[PDB]
Amino acid sequence: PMFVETQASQGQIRATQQQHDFTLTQVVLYRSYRHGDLPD
Amino acid sequence: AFRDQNILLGTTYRIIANALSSEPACLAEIEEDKARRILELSGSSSEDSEKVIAGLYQRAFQHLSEAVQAAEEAAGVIDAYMTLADFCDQQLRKEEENAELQAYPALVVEKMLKALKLNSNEARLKFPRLLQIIERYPEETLSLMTKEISSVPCWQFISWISHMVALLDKDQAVAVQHSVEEITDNYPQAIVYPFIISSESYSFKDTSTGHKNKEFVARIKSKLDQGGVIQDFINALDQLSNPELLFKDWSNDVRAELAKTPVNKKNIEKMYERMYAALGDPKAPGLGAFRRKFIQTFGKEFDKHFGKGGSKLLRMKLSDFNDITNMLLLKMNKDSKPPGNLKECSPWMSDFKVEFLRNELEIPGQYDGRGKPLPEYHVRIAGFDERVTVMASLRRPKRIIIRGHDEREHPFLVKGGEDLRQDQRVEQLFQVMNGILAQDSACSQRALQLRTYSVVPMTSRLGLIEWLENTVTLKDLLLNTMSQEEKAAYLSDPRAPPCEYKDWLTKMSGKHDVGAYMLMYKGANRTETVTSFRKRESKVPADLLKRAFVRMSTSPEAFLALRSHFASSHALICISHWILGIGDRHLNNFMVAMETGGVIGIDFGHAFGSATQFLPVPELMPFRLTRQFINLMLPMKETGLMYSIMVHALRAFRSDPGLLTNTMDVFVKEPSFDWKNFEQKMLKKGGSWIQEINVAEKNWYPRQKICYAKRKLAGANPAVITCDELLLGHEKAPAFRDYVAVARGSKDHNIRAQEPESGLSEETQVKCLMDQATDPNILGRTWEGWEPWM
Amino acid sequence: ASLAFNNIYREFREEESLVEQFVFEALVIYMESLALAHADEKSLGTIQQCCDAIDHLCRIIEKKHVSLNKAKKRRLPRGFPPSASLCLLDLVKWLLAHCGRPQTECRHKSIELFYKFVPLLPGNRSPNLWLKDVLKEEGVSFLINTFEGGGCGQPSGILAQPTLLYLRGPFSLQATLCWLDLLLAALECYNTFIGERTVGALQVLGTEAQSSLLKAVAFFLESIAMHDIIAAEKCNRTSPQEGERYNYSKCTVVVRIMEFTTTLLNTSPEGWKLLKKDLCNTHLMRVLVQTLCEPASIGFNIGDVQVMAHLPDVCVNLMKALKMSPYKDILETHLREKITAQSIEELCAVNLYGPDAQVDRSRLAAVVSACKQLHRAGLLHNILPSQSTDLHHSVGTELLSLVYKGIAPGQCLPSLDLSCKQLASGLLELAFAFGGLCE
Ligand SMILES: Nc1ncnc2c1ncn2[C@@H]1O[C@H](COP(=O)(O)OP(=O)(O)OP(=O)(O)O)[C@@H](O)[C@H]1O
Ligand SMILES: [Mg+2]
């Protein structure tokens, strides 16, 4: 049993930005793949 | 030793008396000393054979009653009770088929209830004979029954609890009323759904007795609504049903009724309000968005045509009513689409939240009946998994997963619209059947057991079937074994057997409808059908099941165990679907367990040879033994595993049929198993017949369905039973002689014609039983949706 | 399911469209799973992980509070009605409606989430003002049906079941626990809403209202509170574990009732007259003087040092609270029969230093802790005068001289045991607490 979805109503991947919104406890930019992302 | 001495001597006299009555000419065949010794031993002196038979029975009853009397001073007192009980019951049946038997219906009731008091099984299963004998002998047993069934443990009736609530509107309700309310006190959830399904049909008569019955039933209905939780559960399950399908079923149960003029609008308005309460009025008891979308599309037209109230459709127009329903259905089979989240179709099941001391929703079908119940360990509902999967059928049932409180998950198959009481009682027959199969040596050593699954009818037009996991149906197994060339070449090619067969039926008849069989059964002789059958047989690959089990298994011991389990299980359900006479065994009605190999039989529409009685093209075969099932066992021939399994199971049944024939009797004598139910059942199925062009009600009489079943369990030719059964349904057919000529065989090509009609044995009967099911003259002219070439 | 959210909150909070669709549906069922975790055993940490997840979602809501209450087409949580939108205000109403639910920790988190969420709503008023608005426009008995009405779904709770007699059948022990937890939930929500001001004390339990809290607490103190001999709630055979759970649940509702009457006294000064017909009589005062003089007779346990570190301050603030009341003399008349002068000249005459002499030395520590707590209440000179000559106190040096000559030679020496040191530290602390006396 997989979730069949809701009955309807009536350069490749983005890069790792270093600037956050939420503070830690106690238009975006894209990139490509760098040889450790996907399996070889 | 005195009690057992008298049991044995009474059994001896009963065996002699039953021997002379079966053929009263062997008495004048044996010996002048033996005949004189029998005539001396009964004591009666007439030389008429009827008086000496009755005298032998009198001595048998004297000895057995002495055994019962000696038994009144666990394994040996209930044997003494049951020997006298079933003896007097057998005598009573031998009278009621066609003043000596006066004190018998008191005696059966008394000794059988006394045995059921002492924890018996054979007296527990033979209990509905008492509720059948109460009506037919109410003078001797109506207060004796009551004062003895009072002091019987209340949980001995749970397996037969669906008979008592149907008895509760009769002249004899007081004989069951104590145990019904004791069950409602002790174990309420064992009676809830059979009470709900029988409150639909009471019709309380107008006496001093019937009014007390109405008071009692109202009291039990007050006691069973523990917070009204079950009616919410039933209603929220009833949300999981396609609304166009409920509308088409309402069109069925309105059209046939309205065709009976002077139409008498009283029940018509009740039918309409029961339609509008679920598919009409939108401000409803708690519908989900699926049914809500349906109502918003098609609730305004239900008074545009049928009227607020409903007295606007009362201009019957029996053609134009079908025009109205077709104008609905043309859109209705397109606009709907089944939803697949449980929140989109049933918010009560989406938002379950088992509450802070209210009640318990026990998962249904958990009181089997034998032994003390102990419901502390029964599973209760904690919540429903939010993934409903729709099966791909015309009467498409939904699959829900109930998360029980005991850490686990239980899947069920909720289907609405049809009556599941027949399926439940067939499964109860299978329980009796493989309880018999376990108390036989040669069958228990093979460990032969039918695979049973629980079926629960909540109410009419709604019920739950247990889901059998890691299974797939047989046609899907065969079609998933096929390669994409074999598959698509079998499905879209005009020289494939599903397309060649229709051309061959036009080539024999001329037409393209189901009337082609009533011309092909006469027009096509024996060699044409056999040769054309092999020509459309050799187009499917020869070994699909063997390749299925090879790519299904990972080792030769695994393959051998899968093939042996398939063979044993299929041979067992072949010989056990013939004793009941279950027909329409096409390829989707078998389901094979992928991790074990065994076969499960489902979808028990046709009960007692009604396939070979009521269908337009009859089905003249005992069971499914097409070419795949016999290519799987190659190189070994058909004398191998399946033949010995069928022979052993048939011998195990025919050893003692007293337990089985009674249960088949109380199944076929139910009012819910009648022609109205069968007619309305096959209507919402498409199947082989679409309508009824019959003379009056097609003559359903269950007087001799069980006469046929007792004949075939007593030793009969099986093809004699097939002619005897289509003689009840096809005598006014244009091809009756050719139906009998096809079923009977040849005296040249078949073993079934080369045998006598009756007095057969087990090896002989399974011999001419496997001959009939594999006859190419039978398989070549059988129904096109059955697929006999597989 | 909670371990998988406590790892991914860091990323799930870092996208707007992922948090402006899923956050309410996430919060609601994490509350629901914590409510389901009431049943299991307090070693699996599932309650801890659900409270961690709810706090992470709560900090997420606290950040993006301007965009959440804007009416937008979001994904509905379970049990919610179909709407054209969803805001934060509907979630606040869901939290308020799920206030008196019987499950302990989910009730706690629901109350504090409501208190954190009546701010961050469009107009930023205090919870005094907003609930006064909704009580102006939905009736006061709506709020009583939220407090009293357990959960929201079934019309149940102590508004439905004020006494245990109305919850009757064959005797099941767990059903009495259900009733106690319903009463405890109503106590906790009443106590919190009256403490954190936010409501009027005299205008919730007053004029024309079926507020069945006082009926329930009167039935509780009348027959159920004092004598948990667990047969006191049957009208069979008891185990320790069936009884120990009962005593634990019975003690922690007595504690919350004491804090509730403390808040009821300290909040409405003229609303003392409410707790007159029922509470300040033999029942509540008998329980209170019992808990003061010996709590373990009523059903507590000595091994749990935490509740033995919470029981001092609750009875101290209770005795301090009705110190400034018309109930000072009922306090005095129920204290000055178990705490008298000869009540301590009785116990001052035992043989203390023997190697088996716990014959009254077991029951001395209860009176010692009782006088310590009475002194920390500040009423020791009220219940004990100076009956020798003057301010130069009699027993405040006589206990000193007692423990002084108790380790005199003369039989050769008294050598000390385990509980002797505990008693003697208590006697010294009471003697020093009597006032002055460093010289
Ligand atoms: N007890 C069961 N357990 C698991 N699966 C089942 C069960 N009963 C039916 N199914 C599945 O549901 C499908 C349809 O069941 P059902 O018998 O209700 O359909 P139907 O409308 O009678 O059509 P058909 O006669 O072709 O099965 C079957 O093909 C089978 O795969
Ligand atoms: Mg089927």
UniProtKB/Swiss-Prot annotation, chain A:
Which cysteine pairs make disulfide bonds? none
Q: Where found, per UniProt? A: Nucleus; Nucleus, Nucleolus; Cytoplasm, Cytosol
Q: Which residues carry this modification: Phosphoserine?
A: S9
Q: What is the effect of changing S9A?
A: Reduced phosphorylation
Report what the Swiss-Prot or TrEMBL entry states about this protein's PTMs. Answer: Autophosphorylated at two clusters, the T2609 cluster and the S2056 cluster. Autophosphorylation induces a conformational change that leads to remodeling of the DNA-PK complex, requisite for efficient end processing and DNA repair. S-nitrosylated by GAPDH.
Q: Which domain of life is it from?
A: Eukaryota
Explain what the record says happens when changing T6A.
Leads to radiation sensitivity and impaired DSB joining. Gives rise to reduced phosphorylation
What effect on the protein does mutating T25A have, as reported in its record? Alleviates phosphorylation, leaves a fully active enzyme with compromised cellular resistance to ionizing radiation without affecting DNA end joining
TM stretches of this protein: none
What does the subunit section of this Swiss-Prot or TrEMBL entry state? DNA-PK is a heterotrimer of PRKDC and the Ku dimer (composed of XRCC6/Ku70 and XRCC5/Ku86). Formation of this complex may be promoted by interaction with ILF3. Component of the core long-range non-homologous end joining (NHEJ) complex (also named DNA-PK complex) composed of PRKDC, LIG4, XRCC4, XRCC6/Ku70, XRCC5/Ku86 and NHEJ1/XLF. Additional component of the NHEJ complex includes PAXX. Following autophosphorylation, PRKDC dissociates from DNA. Interacts with DNA-PKcs-interacting protein (KIP) with the region upstream the kinase domain.
Q: Quote the function comment for this protein.
A: Serine/threonine-protein kinase that acts as a molecular sensor for DNA damage. Involved in DNA non-homologous end joining (NHEJ) required for double-strand break (DSB) repair and V(D)J recombination. Must be bound to DNA to express its catalytic properties. Promotes processing of hairpin DNA structures in V(D)J recombination by activation of the hairpin endonuclease artemis (DCLRE1C). Recruited by XRCC5 and XRCC6 to DNA ends and is required to (1) protect and align broken ends of DNA, thereby preventing their degradation, (2) and sequester the DSB for repair by NHEJ.
Q: Which disease is it linked to?
A: Immunodeficiency 26 with or without neurologic abnormalities: A form of severe combined immunodeficiency characterized by reduced or absent T and B cells, recurrent candidiasis, and lower respiratory tract infections. Some patients show dysmorphic features, severe growth failure, microcephaly, seizures, and impaired neurological functions.
Q: Which family does it belong to?
A: Belongs to the PI3/PI4-kinase family.
Protein name, as recorded:
DNA-dependent protein kinase catalytic subunit
Question: What organism is listed for this UniProt entry?
Answer: Homo sapiens (Human)
What portion of the full-length protein is represented by this chain? Answer: 2604 to 2782 of 4128
Curated annotation (Swiss-Prot), chain B:
Q: Which residues cross the membrane?
A: none
List the residue ranges of the region (Catalytic loop): 581-589
Stretches for region G-loop? 390-396
Q: Which residues form the FATC domain?
A: 758-790
Q: How is it modified after translation?
A: Autophosphorylated at two clusters, the T2609 cluster and the S2056 cluster. Autophosphorylation induces a conformational change that leads to remodeling of the DNA-PK complex, requisite for efficient end processing and DNA repair.
Q: Where is this region: Activation loop?
A: 601-626
- Where the record annotates domain PI3K/PI4K catalytic, the positions are 384-715
Highest taxon in the source lineage: Eukaryota
Record PTM Phosphoserine, positions in chain: S393, S483, S688
Q: Which residues does this entry mark as bearing N6-acetyllysine? A: K283, K300, K304
Q: Where in the cell is it found?
A: Nucleus; Nucleus, Nucleolus; Cytoplasm, Cytosol
Q: Which disease is it linked to?
A: Immunodeficiency 26 with or without neurologic abnormalities: A form of severe combined immunodeficiency characterized by reduced or absent T and B cells, recurrent candidiasis, and lower respiratory tract infections. Some patients show dysmorphic features, severe growth failure, microcephaly, seizures, and impaired neurological functions.
Q: What this chain does, per the record?
A: Serine/threonine-protein kinase that acts as a molecular sensor for DNA damage. Involved in DNA non-homologous end joining (NHEJ) required for double-strand break (DSB) repair and V(D)J recombination. Must be bound to DNA to express its catalytic properties. Promotes processing of hairpin DNA structures in V(D)J recombination by activation of the hairpin endonuclease artemis (DCLRE1C). Recruited by XRCC5 and XRCC6 to DNA ends and is required to (1) protect and align broken ends of DNA, thereby preventing their degradation, (2) and sequester the DSB for repair by NHEJ.
Q: Quaternary state and partners of this protein?
A: DNA-PK is a heterotrimer of PRKDC and the Ku dimer (composed of XRCC6/Ku70 and XRCC5/Ku86). Formation of this complex may be promoted by interaction with ILF3. Component of the core long-range non-homologous end joining (NHEJ) complex (also named DNA-PK complex) composed of PRKDC, LIG4, XRCC4, XRCC6/Ku70, XRCC5/Ku86 and NHEJ1/XLF. Additional component of the NHEJ complex includes PAXX. Following autophosphorylation, PRKDC dissociates from DNA. Interacts with DNA-PKcs-interacting protein (KIP) with the region upstream the kinase domain.
Q: In which family does this protein belong, per the annotation?
A: Belongs to the PI3/PI4-kinase family.
Q: What is this protein called?
A: DNA-dependent protein kinase catalytic subunit
- What is the organism field in this record? Homo sapiens (Human)
* Boundaries of the shown chain within the full protein: 3322 to 4128 of 4128
